[PDB]
């Protein structure tokens, strides 16, 4: 019963010329991109049946696309709805897809992929089933298998074929483990595509020219993959070779080294499927690959990551949090205030997006060092990673550093990133309000100070907005847009367009204490400091942070985020709630931050914090921590430490959803991932509640059950809010 099929519409156009070459042109009618949906599986199933039925009159096949891209996507809506009881349907579906490619791969005739645009995921897997791949050397077209970013693996033969092409080590580290995307010139160097052409018009003609040339110069080996020949030698050997087996035990350990012990199952499954596939024949390896793919699609982690990195990110880029009805207003010249580490990058990401920006600071020497931050990032791109070109000179020609305030004549977009002092920002904005153009926008890179009070320094308060960047803005992709009480919708509409133009993803929040990103980080770092004061080993706290999924351990972050500045937030929030008539209940972590400051250890700036610092490098933990906080006298389970730092952020983001700081759960998930470092496997701090998986169960029911258990043993701050049906 197993065949090439699993009333749709046809997505493949058939054409056979007089030479016998069949040109399969992928052209999905429903949509502008070729997507691996139910229509494609039926279309390709019909196409490969006709190739077998007409094999006498056919001499070669050319797989091309009628879209601007080649092939990229898949019905994510079906994959996220796959329950563990549907593992059989998932397996048979992916087995059918690979069966179609395996038939196309073994027709005894050369098949050529004509890659005109992006070939991602299932698209590259189709091209990898071919014998010769020609790519059009046009920028914007990618080639990769980014299934790991959705908690999945390349189930359509990606793992099996990349390993047969490159070997276990290179295929995993370079192609599979990270879903790396390659440019057509880059993909030619490693071996994904075999040759390049300048224009897409000469793509298919060159594909047919290679077929005639292949049949004439190599008739016996035409249409045969290297792994289908007798005496095939896998690059780097098989797991039984003494060379590869000598280092094979280090492949999983180095994977745990990179993942830091985080419960992300997809990288482990890819490595397992790759090595187990290399021990058996190609057809058996494909089946092993299918069983690991079904293991991930039915898992909860892949549903979290598909929810965040596909659905939530697509809804944000669709202008979900942007106010509808407002058109598009342009940006003539951007003005950055403060050439510090944050401010220097804003001038870079703005200039990298083609915006001509003027970077102003106090002294000219400070402004030049800010532009030097962009040049340091360009030395690693122009003549290192080969990512830049002679265009980066125009990037740096956009940044015009200065110290005179009169150089802001004609600036339409003003972003400021100065020290966190409201009296200072009230003065620098009053000296620029009348200088820049009237309808200009007054952005403020602020992480704590409320925008409503900060906007009073200017007359046109409706154009004042909070534009919160994260460091370094050259790499961090989240921009937190904070609405003031008087902020107009047309103001944040222009900001929403800007953040999408500089290649970032925006979230819109309302003005409140700690906004959303700063407020939830505080609960994360304060949860670790509370544990240290309780007597928890600081090494366990750092392990609990990295094994939870965070990029940086919490104590290491408590030194980057200066420990003195955390104390100033503590005294500021107390005065705010006390001036409102309420009573302030201190957090347990504040007694810890007061002891570290009293001991003269404030973080990396002073050169001493929780870690020791020598020659600008972070050394080990300070040996005096164990005796200072009685560390070791409290040994809770490591999972309790992991859950404490994850639940505290999850509960706090729920409060932000109740208080109205966030408008959509998509901004909560994406805002926590790209601005807080919340573990990507959770799919966001809001998805963490609905997709929680622990000993108590799965879902919101087990979350509030585990929250009450954490609250019954570690304090009533872990009790779930009322918004969670109890």
């Amino acid at each position: 019963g197993s065949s090439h099929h699993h009333m749709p519409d046809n997505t493949i156009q058939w054409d056979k010329d007089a030479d016998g070459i069949v040109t399969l042109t992928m052209d999905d009618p429903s949509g502008s991109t070729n997507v691996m949906n139910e229509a494609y599986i039926e279309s390709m199933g019909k196409a490969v049946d006709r190739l077998v039925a007409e094999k006498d009159s056919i001499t070669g096949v050319v797989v091309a696309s009628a879209k601007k891209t080649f092939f990229a996507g898949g019905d994510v809506k079906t994959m996220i709805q796959a329950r563990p009881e549907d593992a059989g349907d998932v397996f048979n579906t992916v087995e059918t897809i690979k069966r179609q490619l395996r038939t196309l791969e073994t027709l005894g005739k050369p098949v050529v992929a004509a890659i005109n645009g992006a070939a991602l995921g299932g698209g590259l897997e189709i091209a990898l089933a071919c014998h010769h791949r020609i790519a059009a050397d046009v920028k914007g077209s990618q080639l990769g298998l980014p299934a790991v970013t959705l908690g999945l693996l390349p189930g359509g033969g990606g793992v099996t074929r990349t390993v047969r092409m490159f070997g276990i080590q290179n295929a995993f580290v370079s192609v599979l483990a990270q879903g790396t995307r390659f440019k057509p010139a880059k993909a030619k160097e490693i071996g994904l595509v075999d040759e390049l052409v300048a224009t897409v018009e000469e793509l298919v003609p060159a594909a047919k020219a290679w077929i005639k040339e292949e049949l004439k110069a190599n008739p016996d080996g035409a249409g045969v993959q290297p792994w289908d020949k007798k005496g095939y030698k896998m690059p780097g050997g098989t797991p039984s070779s003494p060379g590869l087996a000598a280092i094979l035990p280090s492949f999983p350990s180095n994977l745990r080294k990179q993942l830091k012990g985080a419960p992300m199952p997809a990288p482990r499954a890819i490595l397992a499927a790759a090595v187990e596939g290399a021990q058996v024949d190609f057809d058996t390896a494909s089946r092993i690959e299918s069983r690991y793919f079904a293991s991930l699609v039915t898992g909860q982690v892949a549903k979290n990551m598909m929810q965040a990195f596909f659905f939530d990110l697509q809804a944000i880029n669709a202008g979900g949090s942007r106010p509808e009805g407002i058109g598009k207003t342009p940006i003539k010249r951007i003005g950055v205030l403060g050439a510090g580490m944050m401010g220097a990058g804003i001038a870079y990401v703005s200039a990298k997006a083609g915006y001509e920006v003027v970077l102003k600071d106090v002294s000219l020497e400070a402004a030049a060092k800010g532009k030097g931050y962009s040049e340091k990032l360009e030395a690693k791109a122009l003549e290192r990673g080969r990512t830049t070109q002679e265009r980066s000179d125009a990037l740096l020609a956009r940044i015009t550093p200065t110290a005179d305030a009169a150089d802001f004549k004609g600036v339409d977009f003003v972003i400021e990133a100065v020290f966190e002092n409201q009296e200072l920002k009230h003065k620098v904005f009053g000296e620029i309000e009348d200088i820049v153009e009237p309808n200009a926008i007054l952005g403020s890179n602020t992480s704590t100070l409320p925008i409503t009070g900060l906007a009073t320094g200017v007359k046109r308060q409706e154009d004042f907005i909070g534009i919160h960047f994260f460091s370094p803005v050259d790499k961090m992709p989240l921009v937190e847009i904070i609405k003031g009480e008087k902020t107009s919708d047309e103001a944040l509409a222009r900001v929403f367009d800007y953040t999408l133009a500089i290649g970032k993803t925006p979230i819109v929040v309302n003005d409140s204490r700690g906004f959303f990103t700063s407020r939830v980080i505080g609960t994360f770092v304060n949860e670790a400091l509370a544990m240290l004061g309780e007597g928890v080993e600081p090494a366990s706290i750092e392990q609990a942070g990295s094994q939870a999924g965070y990029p940086a351990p919490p104590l290491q972050l408590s030194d980057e985020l200066n420990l003195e500045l955390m104390h100033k937030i503590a005294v500021a929030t107390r005065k705010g709630v006390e001036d409102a008539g309420g009573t302030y209940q201190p957090h347990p972590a504040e007694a810890v931050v007061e002891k570290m400051i009293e001991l003269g250890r404030s973080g990396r700036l002073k050169g001493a914090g929780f870690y020791e610092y020598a020659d600008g490098k972070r050394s080990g933990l300070w040996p005096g921590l164990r005796e200072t906080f009685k560390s070791g006298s409290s040994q809770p389970p490591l999972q309790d430490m992991i859950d404490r730092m994850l639940f505290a952020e999850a509960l706090e983001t729920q409060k932000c959803l109740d208080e109205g700081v966030l408008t959509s759960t998509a901004d909560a998930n994406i805002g926590s991932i790209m601005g807080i470092g919340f573990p990507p496997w959770t799919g966001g701090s809001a998805q963490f509640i609905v997709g929680y998986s622990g000993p108590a169960g799965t879902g919101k029911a087990a979350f509030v059950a585990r929250a009450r258990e954490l609250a019954a043993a570690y304090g009533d701050r872990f009790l779930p809010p009322e918004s969670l049906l109890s």
């Binding site: 094979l248 035990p249 999983p252 350990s253 745990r256 080294k257 012990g261 187990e276 080993e537 070791g632």
Partner: protein
């Protein structure tokens, strides 16, 4: 019913690089020991020998195909003598003796020949592969780290410094040299010879009797490049989260040597000895198998020792000699700190740090070492234990008779 030891001999241990035993196939090492047992009792009816149990950790190539059965047939032994290879890692030698004692104790076997053989210069470590190391899903889940990483972690947790482990390595070289100097090994070490009777090796050539405390301190940590490239340091610290950094203290001088060798023990019942005119040398009192965390791996000896003491009904005070294999110095120091064992009881004749560690044969070698010291000192009880891969533990209590 009761299991007794009648003979316990071994070969000298030839070192790895430019070793004398490199030209000797491991099958020859075992038959040479069988020949020696036949020279001591030429009137022994070998048809009563029920089985021949040989431990071997890398049973491939020269050591594949049930080398125990190959020895039975190559040595001209009766065909009814059986033969079976087992692998419980570096406790394979003692597991063979324990299984032999348990086979004798069951009554369904009368006279068993236990031992082990390893030719690490010919069959390197890990030649047999394995899922724990080579299968990613198995490796990633059990958090596999090499035994040397667990050794440095032991010294880090227990506070054993570089000087502390080098002080034991010096002590092992000294007591092994004193043991060879006093002729303690004269009767139990059978020199290896070729088919012409010419000498090949007559002593443990891995020993460095002229080692100084300052000479050990000049050695480099040999496992610093294994942990940095393999990432095994980070894996070990995910399980042991409270430990901040690994202190790499083990080197070539304070770790067991890679050597070739073979050992052989004859275990039988009390009835089998009287029928053959054999005098019993010791009695197997109790055996025990236990284990501990496979990441640290080398802490198995502690619970295995406590279990064999409870089964025999004895405490640490009742045991006169403690023999723990010196795979790494920190393992011995840790096993001593746990059970509070005096130094004068622990590895009195040196160990694997000085004389080498032939994996499959080590358990039987250090057992035969204790049956001699029990007879020499005229002591009563001894306890033999070895650290095992995967976190296992095997302990045996013998009593001189």
């Amino acid at each position: 019913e009761e299991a007794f030891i009648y003979e316990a001999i071994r070969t000298p241990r030839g070192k790895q690089k430019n070793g004398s035993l490199h030209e000797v196939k491991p099958l020859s090492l075992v038959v040479g020991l069988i020949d020696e047992l036949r020279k001591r009792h030429p009137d022994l009816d070998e048809n009563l020998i029920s089985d021949v149990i040989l431990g071997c950790v890398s049973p491939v190539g020269d050591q594949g195909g049930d080398i125990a059965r190959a020895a039975v047939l190559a040595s001209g032994m009766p065909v009814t003598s059986g033969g079976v290879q087992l692998n419980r890692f570096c406790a394979s030698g003692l597991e063979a003796v324990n299984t032999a004692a348990q086979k004798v104790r069951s009554g369904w076997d009368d006279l068993v020949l236990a031992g082990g053989v390893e030719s690490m210069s010919r069959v390197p470590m890990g030649s047999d592969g394995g899922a724990m190391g080579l299968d990613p899903a198995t490796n990633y889940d059990v958090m596999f780290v090499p035994q040397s990483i667990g050794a440095d972690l032991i010294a880090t947790i227990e506070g054993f410094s570089r000087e502390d482990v080098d002080a034991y390595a010096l002590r092992s070289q000294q007591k092994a040299a004193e043991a060879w100097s006093g002729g303690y090994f004269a009767k139990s070490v059978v020199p290896v010879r070729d088919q012409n009777g010419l000498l090949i090796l007559d002593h443990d050539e891995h020993m460095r009797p002229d080692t100084t405390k300052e000479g050990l301190a000049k050695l480099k940590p040999a496992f610093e490049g294994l942990a940095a490239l393999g990432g095994f340091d980070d894996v070990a610290l995910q399980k042991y989260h409270w430990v901040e950094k690994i202190n790499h203290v083990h080197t070539g001088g304070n770790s067991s040597g890679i050597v070739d060798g073979a050992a052989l023990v004859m275990i039988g019942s009390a009835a089998a000895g009287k029928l053959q005119g054999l005098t019993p040398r010791a009695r197997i009192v109790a055996t025990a198998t236990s284990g501990a965390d496979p990441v640290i791996m080398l802490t198995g000896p502690t619970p295995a020792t406590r279990k064999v003491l409870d089964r025999a009904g004895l405490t640490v005070d009742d045991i006169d000699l403690f023999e723990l294999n010196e795979a790494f110095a920190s393992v011995v120091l840790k096993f001593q700190k746990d059970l509070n064992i005096p130094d004068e009881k622990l590895n009195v004749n040196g160990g694997a740090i000085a004389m080498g560690h032939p994996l499959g044969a080590t358990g039987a070698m250090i057992l035969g070492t204790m049956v001699d010291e029990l007879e020499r000192r005229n002591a009563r009880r001894a306890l033999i234990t070895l650290c095992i891969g995967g976190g296992m533990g095997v302990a045996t209590i013998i009593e001189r008779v």
